[PDB]
UniProtKB/Swiss-Prot annotation:
Interacts with LAS17 and MYO5. The gene is BZZ1. This is Protein BZZ1. Plays a role in endocytosis and trafficking to the vacuole. Functions with type I myosins to restore polarity of the actin cytoskeleton after NaCl stress. It comes from Saccharomyces cerevisiae (strain ATCC 204508 / S288c). It comes from the Eukaryota. Present with 5440 molecules/cell in log phase SD medium.
């Protein structure tokens, strides 16, 4: 499955990825209640905030 970024996020840690509006992000591990999804966009992989996407 995938998510589309609707807000920008700037990573704050080596395990996070920056996303920009319009990014299509493939979900690897969905949100487990933490507010973070683990996924990949054009091979960039890491955690990003679920609520910044749809």
């Amino acid at each position: 499955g995938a998510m589309e970024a609707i807000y920008a996020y700037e990573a704050q840690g080596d395990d996070e990825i920056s996303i920009d509006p319009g990014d299509i992000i493939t979900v690897i591990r969905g949100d487990d209640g933490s507010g973070w999804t683990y996924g990949e966009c054009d091979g960039l992989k890491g955690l990003f905030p679920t609520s910044y996407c749809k």
